[PDB]
């Protein structure tokens, strides 16, 4: 009843160009079985959205990667938010929502925007730059560690640690096994920075620890919630901003529309999140036998959701393969959907908005002028190198 496919969605060939195989996965049926890894797959918008919005049936506490925490020990203690179901999920979620709230955004926006303007001005003096190392990485590194309250020393561990986290959701391929092999120094650094005395006053980490006396979390929960922000809070934004610059580089007409109305910056970034889907995949585990798209999935089965495919499903989107900065993007699943929908989305959107605003006001053209190199990760989609010439406005 359910089609079986041999496509490996974690192979380098798939990462290099996922779109034909994602169409094959969508068109095979609402639910497929991936023989390579013994998981169910859903690649259409409708079923991805339905799964994400039924956390009781499709749980997260058995892991949101291939590994089933009921079968294998996780490589690090489980996240108290990502790898938890209601009700254990609810109060940690509420604390991070208040830490990364509108009022926090109001406190950090002016500095985030100044840093974005400064970075674009600096890049314009160089002219020819690498929009990954020099922009998509450099800008979040210039604002997010400071907003966390991290000391300066050791920050070189942050991107390696996040690459490890996101590779570890994948199957036991070389990408994952090599990441785990190299992990010990990065885990050591990150775990130490999660302790209250190592987080500067006023930053996100100190705020998490300050929430430990309300009855929502206890002091022993705060280090792992800081760990959540150091896991998910940087590499995601690197690939989101890199996606937006890559889109503007490939669609000069959309750069020109953005220049003409810089208030499109926030939606131009949201559209880049839909179009590239820097977070490609999440898993769930069934807690019962369940009917989904006419297939009966047994209890205890891993289900793989193709967020990037859902975001390009023509059943849901008009001209899905077009980058359109005035698209109505509401409903895309690039930040997830439902109770686990990205709790950091306001930080992500703030960074993306102020960077695209700086580009809109200061840059007249973005021209690829060197070999583009992709960066391979089991969960994240993005580039290793994006050589561009920036022409000043
Ligand atoms: C463009 C940037 C980002 C993208 C595309 C993204 C994507 C996502 C997605 C798809 C999920 C849902 C995972 C699931 O359903 O299992 C998620 C959850 C999460 N993200 Fe983001 N994220 C981004 C930025 C950030 C930032 C900046 C932070 C923190 C500062 C962050 C922290 C988290 C956390 C803690 C969760 C778990 C929430 C929960 O389980 O309730 N993310 N993210
Ligand atoms: O450590 C955390 O809590 C954390 C790690 C990774 C993510 C993540 C985001 C999107 C997809 C998969 C995982 C979320 C939270
Ligand atoms: Cl760790
Ligand atoms: Mg068929």
Tab-separated table of C-alpha atoms and ligand atoms in Angstrom:
chain	number	residue	atom	x	y	z
A	1	UNK	CA	0.000	0.000	0.000
A	2	UNK	CA	2.862	2.335	0.893
A	3	UNK	CA	5.610	2.861	-1.713
A	4	UNK	CA	9.145	1.825	-0.805
A	5	UNK	CA	12.008	3.993	-2.028
A	6	UNK	CA	15.786	3.596	-1.891
A	7	UNK	CA	16.458	7.348	-1.871
A	8	UNK	CA	18.960	8.286	0.837
A	9	UNK	CA	17.987	11.809	2.012
A	10	UNK	CA	21.254	11.991	3.995
A	11	UNK	CA	23.599	11.205	1.086
A	12	UNK	CA	25.942	13.806	-0.344
A	13	UNK	CA	24.323	13.431	-3.775
A	14	UNK	CA	20.943	14.290	-2.237
A	15	UNK	CA	22.332	17.300	-0.354
A	16	UNK	CA	24.004	18.511	-3.553
A	17	UNK	CA	20.623	18.791	-5.280
A	18	UNK	CA	17.620	17.615	-3.251
A	19	UNK	CA	14.811	18.931	-5.411
A	20	UNK	CA	14.273	16.088	-7.933
A	21	UNK	CA	14.279	13.494	-5.149
A	22	UNK	CA	11.948	15.612	-3.013
A	23	UNK	CA	9.479	15.733	-5.906
A	24	UNK	CA	9.819	11.950	-6.284
A	25	UNK	CA	9.062	11.572	-2.557
A	26	UNK	CA	6.031	13.889	-2.746
A	27	UNK	CA	4.607	12.297	-5.857
A	28	UNK	CA	5.033	8.700	-4.677
A	29	UNK	CA	2.258	9.231	-2.132
A	30	UNK	CA	1.411	11.009	1.111
A	31	UNK	CA	3.508	8.492	3.085
A	32	UNK	CA	6.529	6.555	1.827
A	33	UNK	CA	8.869	4.026	3.393
A	34	UNK	CA	12.603	4.716	3.133
A	35	UNK	CA	14.231	1.268	2.926
A	36	UNK	CA	17.735	2.703	3.392
A	37	UNK	CA	17.072	3.681	7.016
A	38	UNK	CA	13.814	1.858	7.917
A	39	UNK	CA	11.784	5.026	8.525
A	40	UNK	CA	8.531	6.397	7.172
A	41	UNK	CA	8.758	9.625	5.194
A	42	UNK	CA	6.305	12.446	4.551
A	43	UNK	CA	7.256	15.094	2.032
A	44	UNK	CA	4.007	16.928	1.201
A	45	UNK	CA	2.935	20.048	3.068
A	46	UNK	CA	-0.346	18.585	4.300
A	47	UNK	CA	1.152	15.553	6.090
A	48	UNK	CA	4.206	17.418	7.416
A	49	UNK	CA	1.848	19.980	8.921
A	50	UNK	CA	-0.467	17.307	10.342
A	51	UNK	CA	2.379	15.348	11.953
A	52	UNK	CA	3.959	18.417	13.559
A	53	UNK	CA	0.575	19.375	15.007
A	54	UNK	CA	-0.128	15.996	16.655
A	55	UNK	CA	2.608	15.766	19.327
A	56	UNK	CA	0.692	13.105	21.247
A	57	UNK	CA	0.807	10.588	18.411
A	58	UNK	CA	4.100	11.782	16.895
A	59	UNK	CA	6.246	12.423	19.932
A	60	UNK	CA	9.613	14.130	20.383
A	61	UNK	CA	10.869	12.522	23.626
A	62	UNK	CA	12.174	9.506	21.705
A	63	UNK	CA	14.341	11.929	19.733
A	64	UNK	CA	13.899	14.149	16.679
A	65	UNK	CA	16.716	12.393	14.817
A	66	UNK	CA	16.917	8.853	13.476
A	67	UNK	CA	18.002	7.434	16.832
A	68	UNK	CA	15.153	6.190	19.044
A	69	UNK	CA	16.008	7.165	22.645
A	70	UNK	CA	13.928	4.212	23.843
A	71	UNK	CA	16.370	1.931	21.990
A	72	UNK	CA	19.715	3.752	22.229
A	73	UNK	CA	21.175	6.181	24.724
A	74	UNK	CA	21.410	9.742	23.349
A	75	UNK	CA	24.920	11.031	22.675
A	76	UNK	CA	24.317	13.817	25.229
A	77	UNK	CA	21.629	14.264	27.911
A	78	UNK	CA	18.294	14.950	26.172
A	79	UNK	CA	17.211	18.512	25.559
A	80	UNK	CA	14.599	19.585	28.128
A	81	UNK	CA	12.643	21.352	25.390
A	82	UNK	CA	13.357	19.847	21.941
A	83	UNK	CA	13.377	16.214	23.146
A	84	UNK	CA	10.451	16.507	25.571
A	85	UNK	CA	6.706	16.119	25.118
A	86	UNK	CA	3.868	17.860	26.942
A	87	UNK	CA	3.588	18.189	29.815
A	88	UNK	CA	7.336	18.046	30.604
A	89	UNK	CA	7.904	20.345	27.614
A	90	UNK	CA	5.522	23.108	28.664
A	91	UNK	CA	7.292	25.002	31.419
A	92	UNK	CA	10.808	24.939	29.885
A	93	UNK	CA	9.137	26.154	26.672
A	94	UNK	CA	7.438	28.982	28.545
A	95	UNK	CA	10.721	30.088	30.112
A	96	UNK	CA	12.540	30.201	26.779
A	97	UNK	CA	9.557	32.033	25.240
A	98	UNK	CA	9.835	34.722	27.912
A	99	UNK	CA	13.618	34.889	27.619
A	100	UNK	CA	13.364	35.345	23.831
A	101	UNK	CA	10.298	37.578	23.976
A	102	UNK	CA	9.306	40.873	22.352
A	103	UNK	CA	10.696	42.883	25.280
A	104	UNK	CA	14.026	41.190	24.897
A	105	UNK	CA	13.859	41.947	21.173
A	106	UNK	CA	13.221	45.593	21.975
A	107	UNK	CA	16.284	45.628	24.237
A	108	UNK	CA	18.641	44.142	21.611
A	109	UNK	CA	17.320	45.512	18.298
A	110	UNK	CA	19.343	48.726	18.187
A	111	UNK	CA	22.642	46.944	18.742
A	112	UNK	CA	21.761	44.131	16.340
A	113	UNK	CA	20.945	46.670	13.615
A	114	UNK	CA	24.070	48.768	14.244
A	115	UNK	CA	26.190	45.623	13.972
A	116	UNK	CA	24.500	44.688	10.692
A	117	UNK	CA	25.029	48.155	9.196
A	118	UNK	CA	28.645	48.164	10.379
A	119	UNK	CA	29.329	44.756	8.844
A	120	UNK	CA	27.895	45.726	5.456
A	121	UNK	CA	29.907	48.969	5.465
A	122	UNK	CA	33.036	46.948	6.271
A	123	UNK	CA	32.318	44.435	3.501
A	124	UNK	CA	31.739	47.230	0.967
A	125	UNK	CA	35.270	48.477	1.620
A	126	UNK	CA	36.585	45.044	0.584
A	127	UNK	CA	34.225	44.700	-2.410
A	128	UNK	CA	34.906	41.016	-3.080
A	129	UNK	CA	34.057	38.878	-0.047
A	130	UNK	CA	32.918	35.388	0.966
A	131	UNK	CA	29.306	35.848	1.978
A	132	UNK	CA	29.513	32.788	4.237
A	133	UNK	CA	32.642	33.336	6.348
A	134	UNK	CA	32.565	37.131	6.062
A	135	UNK	CA	28.824	37.750	6.432
A	136	UNK	CA	26.564	34.773	7.202
A	137	UNK	CA	29.010	33.538	9.847
A	138	UNK	CA	30.653	36.813	10.844
A	139	UNK	CA	27.470	38.761	11.576
A	140	UNK	CA	25.759	36.253	13.909
A	141	UNK	CA	29.118	35.669	15.612
A	142	UNK	CA	29.324	39.425	16.188
A	143	UNK	CA	25.936	39.655	17.979
A	144	UNK	CA	24.692	36.307	19.291
A	145	UNK	CA	27.525	35.154	21.622
A	146	UNK	CA	27.474	38.615	23.188
A	147	UNK	CA	23.679	38.539	23.544
A	148	UNK	CA	24.040	35.135	25.273
A	149	UNK	CA	26.551	36.667	27.680
A	150	UNK	CA	29.475	34.409	26.695
A	151	UNK	CA	33.054	35.310	27.433
A	152	UNK	CA	35.285	35.905	24.410
A	153	UNK	CA	37.609	32.946	24.916
A	154	UNK	CA	36.523	29.670	23.341
A	155	UNK	CA	33.873	30.990	20.969
A	156	UNK	CA	35.595	29.080	18.157
A	157	UNK	CA	33.848	26.004	19.619
A	158	UNK	CA	30.325	27.259	18.918
A	159	UNK	CA	29.943	26.507	15.214
A	160	UNK	CA	31.690	23.099	15.523
A	161	UNK	CA	29.414	22.213	18.433
A	162	UNK	CA	26.303	23.180	16.478
A	163	UNK	CA	27.489	21.301	13.389
A	164	UNK	CA	27.844	18.267	15.647
A	165	UNK	CA	24.363	18.692	17.143
A	166	UNK	CA	22.736	18.890	13.739
A	167	UNK	CA	24.799	16.094	12.205
A	168	UNK	CA	23.897	13.891	15.164
A	169	UNK	CA	20.172	13.918	14.256
A	170	UNK	CA	21.119	12.068	11.063
A	171	UNK	CA	21.691	8.383	10.488
A	172	UNK	CA	25.048	6.799	11.424
A	173	UNK	CA	26.785	7.869	8.225
A	174	UNK	CA	30.284	9.326	7.997
A	175	UNK	CA	29.100	12.893	8.664
A	176	UNK	CA	27.590	11.820	11.975
A	177	UNK	CA	30.295	9.432	13.073
A	178	UNK	CA	33.096	11.917	12.357
A	179	UNK	CA	31.267	14.689	14.228
A	180	UNK	CA	30.827	12.553	17.331
A	181	UNK	CA	34.460	11.402	17.151
A	182	UNK	CA	35.661	15.028	17.412
A	183	UNK	CA	33.058	16.229	19.903
A	184	UNK	CA	34.707	16.077	23.325
A	185	UNK	CA	36.410	19.516	23.407
A	186	UNK	CA	33.325	21.252	22.058
A	187	UNK	CA	30.990	19.554	24.547
A	188	UNK	CA	33.386	20.464	27.353
A	189	UNK	CA	33.433	24.129	26.388
A	190	UNK	CA	29.683	24.414	25.832
A	191	UNK	CA	28.740	22.610	29.044
A	192	UNK	CA	31.028	24.863	31.085
A	193	UNK	CA	29.587	28.088	29.627
A	194	UNK	CA	26.079	26.945	30.675
A	195	UNK	CA	26.883	27.421	34.367
A	196	UNK	CA	25.433	30.576	35.911
A	197	UNK	CA	28.757	32.268	36.896
A	198	UNK	CA	30.014	32.095	33.307
A	199	UNK	CA	27.095	34.044	31.815
A	200	UNK	CA	27.331	37.840	31.813
A	201	UNK	CA	24.568	39.908	33.440
A	202	UNK	CA	21.669	40.910	31.203
A	203	UNK	CA	22.242	38.259	28.514
A	204	UNK	CA	20.048	35.351	27.506
A	205	UNK	CA	21.928	32.843	29.676
A	206	UNK	CA	21.689	34.936	32.839
A	207	UNK	CA	17.996	35.467	32.111
A	208	UNK	CA	17.398	31.709	31.928
A	209	UNK	CA	19.080	31.260	35.300
A	210	UNK	CA	17.044	34.141	36.723
A	211	UNK	CA	13.864	32.228	35.857
A	212	UNK	CA	14.795	29.400	38.209
A	213	UNK	CA	12.816	30.721	41.167
A	214	UNK	CA	9.328	31.064	39.653
A	215	UNK	CA	8.369	27.381	39.827
A	216	UNK	CA	8.692	26.945	36.077
A	217	UNK	CA	12.218	25.496	36.093
A	218	UNK	CA	14.616	24.603	38.872
A	219	UNK	CA	18.244	25.730	39.031
A	220	UNK	CA	19.458	22.319	37.800
A	221	UNK	CA	17.416	22.766	34.583
A	222	UNK	CA	18.930	26.111	33.638
A	223	UNK	CA	22.296	24.831	32.312
A	224	UNK	CA	20.596	22.505	29.810
A	225	UNK	CA	18.292	25.313	28.653
A	226	UNK	CA	21.309	27.552	28.060
A	227	UNK	CA	22.706	24.558	26.170
A	228	UNK	CA	19.618	24.636	23.958
A	229	UNK	CA	20.353	28.203	22.853
A	230	UNK	CA	24.039	27.421	22.271
A	231	UNK	CA	22.956	24.391	20.209
A	232	UNK	CA	20.219	25.877	18.027
A	233	UNK	CA	20.820	29.611	18.235
A	234	UNK	CA	23.816	30.256	15.957
A	235	UNK	CA	24.341	27.764	13.093
A	236	UNK	CA	20.674	27.992	12.111
A	237	UNK	CA	20.928	31.765	11.681
A	238	UNK	CA	24.192	31.400	9.720
A	239	UNK	CA	22.391	29.233	7.204
A	240	UNK	CA	19.285	31.458	7.206
A	241	UNK	CA	21.251	34.621	6.475
A	242	UNK	CA	23.432	32.743	3.994
A	243	UNK	CA	20.266	31.495	2.280
A	244	UNK	CA	18.894	35.048	2.003
A	245	UNK	CA	22.129	36.401	0.521
A	246	UNK	CA	22.287	33.446	-1.884
A	247	UNK	CA	18.722	34.154	-2.969
A	248	UNK	CA	19.436	37.837	-3.535
A	249	UNK	CA	22.588	36.912	-5.464
A	250	UNK	CA	20.638	34.566	-7.752
A	251	UNK	CA	17.485	36.712	-8.136
A	252	UNK	CA	18.744	40.249	-8.880
A	253	UNK	CA	15.204	41.384	-9.636
A	254	UNK	CA	14.279	40.642	-6.042
A	255	UNK	CA	17.328	42.511	-4.745
A	256	UNK	CA	16.090	45.462	-6.776
A	257	UNK	CA	12.601	45.249	-5.287
A	258	UNK	CA	14.118	45.040	-1.799
A	259	UNK	CA	16.284	48.124	-2.459
A	260	UNK	CA	13.196	49.995	-3.579
A	261	UNK	CA	11.338	49.185	-0.341
A	262	UNK	CA	13.618	48.208	2.548
A	263	UNK	CA	10.554	47.508	4.707
A	264	UNK	CA	10.301	44.249	2.715
A	265	UNK	CA	13.433	43.045	4.563
A	266	UNK	CA	11.594	40.920	7.123
A	267	UNK	CA	9.477	39.156	4.508
A	268	UNK	CA	12.454	38.762	2.161
A	269	UNK	CA	14.174	36.870	4.975
A	270	UNK	CA	11.092	34.788	5.756
A	271	UNK	CA	10.825	33.882	2.069
A	272	UNK	CA	14.485	32.847	2.107
A	273	UNK	CA	13.729	30.530	5.039
A	274	UNK	CA	10.885	28.968	3.038
A	275	UNK	CA	12.848	28.808	-0.205
A	276	UNK	CA	16.051	27.267	1.109
A	277	UNK	CA	14.753	25.744	4.395
A	278	UNK	CA	18.068	25.875	6.282
A	279	UNK	CA	16.608	23.253	8.624
A	280	UNK	CA	15.670	20.464	6.205
A	281	UNK	CA	14.346	17.620	8.335
A	282	UNK	CA	12.936	16.612	11.702
A	283	UNK	CA	11.852	13.192	12.938
A	284	UNK	CA	9.082	12.077	15.289
A	285	UNK	CA	8.318	8.661	16.797
A	286	UNK	CA	4.807	7.178	16.786
A	287	UNK	CA	3.348	6.432	20.224
A	288	UNK	CA	0.556	4.229	18.837
A	289	UNK	CA	-0.613	2.677	15.629
A	290	UNK	CA	-1.888	5.546	13.478
A	291	UNK	CA	-3.464	6.143	10.079
A	292	UNK	CA	-1.680	8.862	8.125
A	293	UNK	CA	-2.387	9.494	4.455
A	294	UNK	CA	-4.022	6.076	4.147
A	295	UNK	CA	-1.070	4.131	5.575
A	296	UNK	CA	-1.228	2.359	8.930
A	297	UNK	CA	1.995	3.139	10.779
A	298	UNK	CA	2.719	0.926	13.762
A	299	UNK	CA	3.705	2.078	17.228
A	300	UNK	CA	7.319	3.007	17.841
A	301	UNK	CA	8.160	3.922	14.233
A	302	UNK	CA	10.343	6.812	13.147
A	303	UNK	CA	8.700	9.299	10.790
A	304	UNK	CA	10.870	11.739	8.802
A	305	UNK	CA	9.367	15.121	7.860
A	306	UNK	CA	10.849	16.931	4.851
A	307	UNK	CA	10.375	20.581	5.858
A	308	UNK	CA	12.156	21.858	2.775
A	309	UNK	CA	9.968	19.711	0.519
A	310	UNK	CA	6.789	20.835	2.328
A	311	UNK	CA	7.932	24.429	1.717
A	312	UNK	CA	8.166	23.723	-2.038
A	313	UNK	CA	5.070	21.534	-2.408
A	314	UNK	CA	3.021	22.841	-5.383
A	315	UNK	CA	-0.092	21.464	-3.690
A	316	UNK	CA	0.375	24.310	-1.178
A	317	UNK	CA	2.447	27.004	-2.915
A	318	UNK	CA	2.107	28.830	-6.209
A	319	UNK	CA	5.392	28.800	-8.143
A	320	UNK	CA	7.181	27.195	-5.179
A	321	UNK	CA	10.578	27.278	-6.886
A	322	UNK	CA	10.469	31.067	-7.226
A	323	UNK	CA	12.021	33.395	-4.657
A	324	UNK	CA	9.355	36.089	-4.164
A	325	UNK	CA	9.933	38.665	-1.417
A	326	UNK	CA	6.277	39.724	-1.433
A	327	UNK	CA	4.929	36.150	-1.150
A	328	UNK	CA	2.429	35.482	1.598
A	329	UNK	CA	4.785	33.191	3.543
A	330	UNK	CA	2.516	32.526	6.551
A	331	UNK	CA	2.217	28.803	7.090
A	332	UNK	CA	5.630	27.733	5.856
A	333	UNK	CA	7.232	25.103	8.095
A	334	UNK	CA	10.852	26.309	7.995
A	335	UNK	CA	10.568	27.112	11.728
A	336	UNK	CA	8.352	24.086	12.383
A	337	UNK	CA	4.725	24.213	13.457
A	338	UNK	CA	2.786	23.616	16.646
A	339	UNK	CA	4.056	23.273	20.189
A	340	UNK	CA	7.755	22.998	19.259
A	341	UNK	CA	7.677	25.748	16.615
A	342	UNK	CA	11.030	27.508	16.872
A	343	UNK	CA	11.112	29.340	20.217
A	344	UNK	CA	13.998	31.461	18.870
A	345	UNK	CA	12.136	32.636	15.749
A	346	UNK	CA	12.060	36.282	16.912
A	347	UNK	CA	15.860	36.306	17.268
A	348	UNK	CA	16.250	34.648	13.874
A	349	UNK	CA	13.907	37.103	12.199
A	350	UNK	CA	15.494	40.084	13.943
A	351	UNK	CA	18.977	39.145	12.684
A	352	UNK	CA	17.734	38.391	9.189
A	353	UNK	CA	15.646	41.556	8.988
A	354	UNK	CA	18.362	43.963	10.094
A	355	UNK	CA	20.956	42.354	7.824
A	356	UNK	CA	18.675	42.467	4.781
A	357	UNK	CA	17.775	46.079	5.683
A	358	UNK	CA	21.468	46.975	5.692
A	359	UNK	CA	21.916	45.288	2.292
A	360	UNK	CA	18.795	46.998	0.945
A	361	UNK	CA	20.020	50.466	1.920
A	362	UNK	CA	23.725	50.097	1.118
A	363	UNK	CA	24.240	47.593	-1.738
A	364	UNK	CA	23.298	48.015	-5.398
A	365	UNK	CA	24.370	44.610	-6.719
A	366	UNK	CA	25.437	41.193	-5.416
A	367	UNK	CA	27.275	39.189	-8.073
A	368	UNK	CA	28.663	35.699	-7.571
A	369	UNK	CA	32.281	35.975	-8.667
A	370	UNK	CA	33.838	32.675	-7.607
A	371	UNK	CA	33.136	28.959	-7.169
A	372	UNK	CA	30.153	28.255	-4.921
A	373	UNK	CA	30.807	25.435	-2.427
A	374	UNK	CA	28.089	23.612	-0.500
A	375	UNK	CA	28.385	22.672	3.167
A	376	UNK	CA	27.112	19.186	4.007
A	377	UNK	CA	25.195	18.469	7.224
A	378	UNK	CA	22.634	15.785	8.027
A	379	UNK	CA	20.016	18.357	9.085
A	380	UNK	CA	21.125	21.803	7.857
A	381	UNK	CA	21.222	23.023	4.264
A	382	UNK	CA	23.626	25.782	3.385
A	383	UNK	CA	26.831	26.865	1.761
A	384	UNK	CA	30.493	26.594	2.703
A	385	UNK	CA	31.679	29.368	0.414
A	386	UNK	CA	29.760	32.056	-1.507
A	387	UNK	CA	32.183	34.433	-3.250
A	388	UNK	CA	30.395	37.652	-4.185
A	389	UNK	CA	31.239	41.117	-5.366
A	390	UNK	CA	29.216	43.787	-3.532
A	391	UNK	CA	28.621	46.991	-5.475
A	392	UNK	CA	27.800	49.999	-3.277
A	393	UNK	CA	24.570	51.911	-3.783
B	1	LIG	C1	16.739	30.724	10.586
B	1	LIG	C2	17.008	30.264	11.824
B	1	LIG	C3	16.273	29.079	12.485
B	1	LIG	C4	15.569	28.093	11.916
B	1	LIG	C5	15.332	27.837	10.407
B	1	LIG	C6	15.070	27.244	12.976
B	1	LIG	C7	14.283	26.123	12.828
B	1	LIG	C8	13.702	25.426	13.884
B	1	LIG	C9	12.737	24.349	13.761
B	1	LIG	C10	12.218	23.773	12.428
B	1	LIG	C11	12.424	23.928	15.004
B	1	LIG	C12	11.404	22.818	15.353
B	1	LIG	C13	12.064	21.495	15.685
B	1	LIG	C14	11.033	20.419	15.911
B	1	LIG	O1	9.835	20.632	15.611
B	1	LIG	O2	11.423	19.345	16.414
B	1	LIG	C15	13.149	24.745	15.957
B	1	LIG	C16	13.105	24.586	17.333
B	1	LIG	C17	13.912	25.286	18.189
B	1	LIG	N1	14.758	26.351	17.881
B	1	LIG	FE1	14.933	27.236	16.071
B	1	LIG	N2	15.506	27.773	14.175
B	1	LIG	C18	16.226	28.907	13.918
B	1	LIG	C19	16.806	29.759	14.837
B	1	LIG	C20	16.844	29.581	16.196
B	1	LIG	C21	17.386	30.502	17.161
B	1	LIG	C22	18.034	31.858	16.796
B	1	LIG	C23	17.238	29.954	18.378
B	1	LIG	C24	17.628	30.503	19.768
B	1	LIG	C25	18.173	31.707	19.948
B	1	LIG	C26	16.570	28.690	18.211
B	1	LIG	C27	16.236	27.805	19.219
B	1	LIG	C28	15.356	26.753	19.069
B	1	LIG	C29	14.889	25.882	20.132
B	1	LIG	C30	15.358	26.020	21.601
B	1	LIG	C31	14.020	25.011	19.610
B	1	LIG	C32	13.225	23.909	20.328
B	1	LIG	C33	11.834	24.494	20.638
B	1	LIG	C34	10.884	23.483	21.232
B	1	LIG	O3	11.203	22.276	21.181
B	1	LIG	O4	9.790	23.869	21.758
B	1	LIG	N3	16.308	28.514	16.864
B	1	LIG	N4	13.935	25.643	15.238
B	2	LIG	O1	19.457	21.662	22.211
B	2	LIG	C1	18.351	22.088	21.816
B	2	LIG	O2	17.409	22.208	22.633
B	2	LIG	C2	18.011	22.129	20.349
B	2	LIG	C3	18.863	21.531	19.434
B	2	LIG	C4	18.516	21.480	18.101
B	2	LIG	C5	17.312	22.005	17.693
B	2	LIG	C6	16.782	21.830	16.286
B	2	LIG	C7	16.126	22.771	15.547
B	2	LIG	C8	15.602	22.414	14.321
B	2	LIG	C9	15.651	21.096	13.871
B	2	LIG	C10	16.249	20.124	14.644
B	2	LIG	C11	16.780	20.495	15.859
B	2	LIG	C12	16.435	22.569	18.600
B	2	LIG	C13	16.792	22.634	19.946
B	3	LIG	CL1	27.043	18.980	25.226
B	4	LIG	MG1	4.380	5.068	-7.461
